[PDB]
């Protein structure tokens, strides 16, 4: 079926989790991507500066938003999302999406700043 799983694997391996310092980080994550049964993987971001915070397993139906790996909350409401993100492969960068119903075509997101604790 439809799956964002290789693209998210292509997203962090070249843009987000690049670097030799992130190589201990991503080796925990690439095995974790093989563990989950969901075809739909979503990356968490604090701001539009593209700083890797966490990873989610969102599905367009009522399946879990549940935090798989990374620093963040466990449960994120659909009110909590602010801006929706995708990944152009050819640019090796992200692009903005207008506000809509989130689904498999969405690749990443950001959330509210008061939800971030100091």
């Amino acid at each position: 079926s439809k799956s964002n799983k290789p693209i998210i694997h292509a997203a962090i391996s070249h843009c987000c989790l690049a670097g030799k310092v992130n190589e201990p980080h991503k080796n925990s994550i690439l095995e974790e991507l093989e563990k989950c049964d969901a075809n739909h993987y979503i990356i968490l971001f604090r701001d539009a500066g593209c700083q890797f915070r966490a990873l989610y397993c969102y599905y367009p139906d009522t399946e879990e938003i549940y935090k798989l790996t990374g620093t963040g909350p466990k449960n994120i409401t659909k009110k909590m999302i602010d801006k929706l993100y995708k990944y152009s492969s050819d640019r090796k960068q992200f692009n903005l999406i207008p506000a809509k119903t989130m689904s498999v075509s969405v690749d990443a997101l950001t959330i509210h700043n008061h939800l971030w604790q100091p």
């Binding site: 290789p6 693209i7 694997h9 292509a10 070249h14 492969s89 050819d90 640019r91 090796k92």
Partner: protein, 426 residues
């Protein structure tokens, strides 16, 4: 909507050198990159193939892949190498010497990351990519083995683009080494899972086409590739140039493929005629389709009257009327419906390009998928059965560090492919 052409091996670098020889001649381009054409058609769609530099210079968005400079040494010292930048001349020392396990698994992978980074340098320089074009041999060691690791990395990088390569099918008559069917065996085991499509080219078929229909005396490989490049250019210029039935290749990949593993195609070229038959033959729309339908115009040694057509693509070039196109398309379906599948009402996809080529008033390009392509694949497998038992010169590939059941897994995956065509055959 841009395309990168990754040419590989001793063959496909020589083969695709003829390709850009055509396209630069097609748009009125100087050998050094200057524009001298006269049409906005030759001016608007430069973006798909070429990168505009300073001084009205157009850089071929295309990288030559080899473990040896000598092939590219001939291209750079030859004509049209002066438009190529040295960034595309990626080479090492030494070469694998027609060995799949050396370039793919042990040695070439060091040069692969140097290739892939320049791909990353160029793909970021693009506006928007549409897909990556390739050309090599199936039994080519540096051609396929390097590329089989490349397509594994590129699909890992870019799942969103079309993965097509242009494959040279190993002729049962023409071989220089005996371990040549080993290389095509290990290729298709990764070519099925990693590529979106490919085309089938046999020089053994093209020897008849140059001789039985064109009456040519001494063809070179480039004379064969002079025919190949027109079939290469017939596919993708319709994606570029305007037309009524402007069909994407990604549109074409949907219609030509019912099952995602069945993506091996039979190219064809309709306006094939010699110089003596120029004065005997008129140029009509039914004239080309009769040579579309003929068995002796196919680039692969297969009997299309023996197998059955899965999907057909009808790429046309020139100023044609839609009534004459569609009725002549329909009558072939009316005549030989035994040659087709049962469960599809129209196996033929039409692609009318309003833009004509130069020289001819009309042209056409046949693209088909049939059940007869398993015939060449059984020539691979039945040779592979005897050669596996005696293990002739296996210790070359054994010292490189490969396993015998990996060959059997490649054999079983090839044994899948034999079973795959038969289940939709009848």
């Amino acid at each position: 909507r841009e395309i990168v052409h990754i040419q590989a091996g001793q063959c496909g670098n020589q083969i695709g050198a003829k390709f850009w020889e055509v396209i630069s001649d097609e748009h009125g381009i100087d050998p050094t990159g200057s524009y001298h054409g006269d049409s906005d058609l030759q001016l608007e769609r430069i973006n798909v193939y070429y990168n505009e530099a300073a001084g009205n210079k157009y850089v071929p968005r295309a990288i030559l892949v080899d473990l040896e400079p000598g092939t590219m040494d001939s291209v750079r010292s030859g004509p049209f190498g002066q438009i190529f930048r040295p960034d595309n001349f990626v080479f090492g020392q030494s070469g694998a010497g027609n060995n799949w396990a050396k370039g793919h698994y042990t040695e070439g992978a060091e040069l692969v990351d140097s290739v892939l980074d320049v791909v990353r340098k160029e793909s970021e320089s693009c506006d928007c990519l549409q897909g990556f074009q390739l050309t090599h041999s199936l039994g080519g060691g540096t051609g396929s083995g390097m590329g089989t690791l490349l397509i594994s990395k590129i699909r890992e990088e870019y799942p969103d683009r079309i993965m097509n390569t242009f494959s040279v099918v190993p002729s049962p008559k023409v071989s220089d080494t005996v371990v040549e069917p080993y290389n095509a065996t290990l290729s298709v085991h990764q070519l099925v899972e990693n590529t979106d499509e490919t085309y089938c080219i046999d020089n053994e078929a093209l020897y008849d086409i140059c001789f039985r229909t064109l009456k040519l005396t001494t063809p070179t490989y480039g004379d064969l590739n002079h025919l190949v490049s027109a079939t290469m250019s017939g596919v993708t210029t319709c994606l570029r140039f305007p037309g009524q039935l402007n069909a994407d290749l990604r549109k074409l990949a949907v219609n030509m493929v019912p099952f995602p593993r069945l993506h091996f195609f039979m190219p064809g070229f309709a306006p094939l005629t010699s110089r003596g038959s120029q004065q005997y033959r008129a140029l009509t729309v039914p004239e080309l389709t009769q040579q579309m339908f003929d068995a002796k115009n196919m680039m692969a040694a297969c009997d299309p009257r023996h197998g059955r057509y899965l999907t057909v693509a009808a790429v046309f070039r020139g100023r044609m009327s839609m009534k004459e196109v569609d009725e002549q398309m329909l009558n072939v379906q009316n005549k030989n419906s035994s040659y087709f599948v049962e469960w599809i009402p129209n196996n033929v996809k039409t692609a009318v390009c309003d833009i004509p080529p130069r020289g001819l008033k009309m042209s056409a390009t046949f693209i088909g998928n049939s059940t007869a392509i398993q015939e060449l694949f059984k020539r691979i497998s039945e040779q592979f059965t005897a050669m596996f038992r005696r293990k002739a010169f296996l210790h070359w590939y054994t010292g490189e560090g490969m396993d015998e059941m990996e060959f059997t897994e490649a054999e079983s995956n090839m044994n899948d492919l034999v079973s795959e065509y038969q289940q939709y055959q009848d």
